[PDB]
Design a protein around this ligand. Sequence first.
Ligand SMILES: Cc1cc2nc3c(=O)[nH]c(=O)nc-3n(C[C@H](O)[C@H](O)[C@H](O)COP(=O)(O)OP(=O)(O)OC[C@H]3O[C@@H](n4cnc5c(N)ncnc54)[C@H](O)[C@@H]3O)c2cc1C
Lengths: 206, 206
Amino acid sequence: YDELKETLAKYNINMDDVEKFDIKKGKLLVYVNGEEHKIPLKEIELSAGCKMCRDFDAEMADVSVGCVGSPDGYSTVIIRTEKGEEIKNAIELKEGVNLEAIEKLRDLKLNRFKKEVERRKAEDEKVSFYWTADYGGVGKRADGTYFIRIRAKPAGWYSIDEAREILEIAEKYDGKIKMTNRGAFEIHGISGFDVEAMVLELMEKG
Amino acid sequence: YDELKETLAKYNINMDDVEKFDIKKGKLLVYVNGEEHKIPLKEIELSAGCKMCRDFDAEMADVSVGCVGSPDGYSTVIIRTEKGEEIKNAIELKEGVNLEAIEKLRDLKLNRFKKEVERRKAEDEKVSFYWTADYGGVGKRADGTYFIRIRAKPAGWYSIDEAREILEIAEKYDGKIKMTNRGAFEIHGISGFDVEAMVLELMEKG
Ligand SMILES: Cc1cc2nc3c(=O)[nH]c(=O)nc-3n(C[C@H](O)[C@H](O)[C@H](O)COP(=O)(O)OP(=O)(O)OC[C@H]3O[C@@H](n4cnc5c(N)ncnc54)[C@H](O)[C@@H]3O)c2cc1C
């Protein structure tokens, strides 16, 4: 609040008189005593934790609502659960949302997060690797690194090509091979900084 | 017996009058009428089953006795068990056996066996893979090929290099990878003709 008020003070805008705020096209819009003042987002310092955030569209909500992707005066509605489906009784909904506009904001937020994580890695600052729990098969070892379990293939049969692919990915991330008593490859010693990239690489290979 | 008798008849020897036989340095020695006759073993047909034999020195006996590697009028004595050690009480034994003379015949016999198995392979003749039981970790599959179980390493840890070596040997012999519920690599589909060569290769890699 103090940062936004101080920023408004720079443009000679009294916060106590503002009619409405808005954030559109990467700019903050202020409506006070008549016309709307345009302030670039770059010029306002965001809450620090927002730099560590990955979730643009509230992907876990029953229903998510925003302005991006839909005409002005309308709200974008993303229905995700049967509870969220009840909004169809309350609102006359239309199709035609601009899906690519929403995805662009997903990527910009993720790139902001990647820059902040890289900066913490370079500066020896603390990182909580909270997104490892986004993925199945990830466990935390006693020493603060992670193991990644590749779900056992039926009857423990692996093609030579498949096994070689697993070893190549393990080598790339300095992982160590452990064979479980259910016939799975489990790769140990993965840095929290590498877990997401390695899992996606494994998923890409099937 | 009939083959030896007819062979001797060709050299004008009546087997009934023979005083002693000997096999030394590639020859059949025949002592008859106070004479020594030498017949190259190459001119004599051996019993068919000997071509499929691997064991020159009776390697499973309590004590094995022969003439190779010791001076004329002595017997070579290879003691292998505590039962065999009792011969030390019956015989004043001497050291100095020519071990290479014995090894030379081990390898000649093995090479003869390899030639006959290869001949049978080429002719699609019946081979009994009786020597697969010389090695641990070898099992017979339902379809007449074999699996080779690599004894699980402690806690199922394998170096990337170790796993790659196993896969390379599996590939060479057209083997298929199965991971056991004790953390072992088990290689399936190995021909009886290849089992020994493959096991020795794995043993060579440690
Ligand atoms: C901080 C912030 C950033 C946003 N950024 C974007 C964006 O980048 N892109 C985008 O498309 N939309 C964004 N929105 C959402 C958008 O501004 C609207 O809130 C949304 O479209 C709903 O509009 P509405 O007219 O349907 O809701 P309304 O009927 O106006 O109701 C708004 C609801 O928002 C809730 N609310 C308001 N402020 C907050 C807050 N600080 N914390 C929690 N709840 C709050 C109120 O409780 C209210 O129920 C943002 C909203 C906020 C609060």
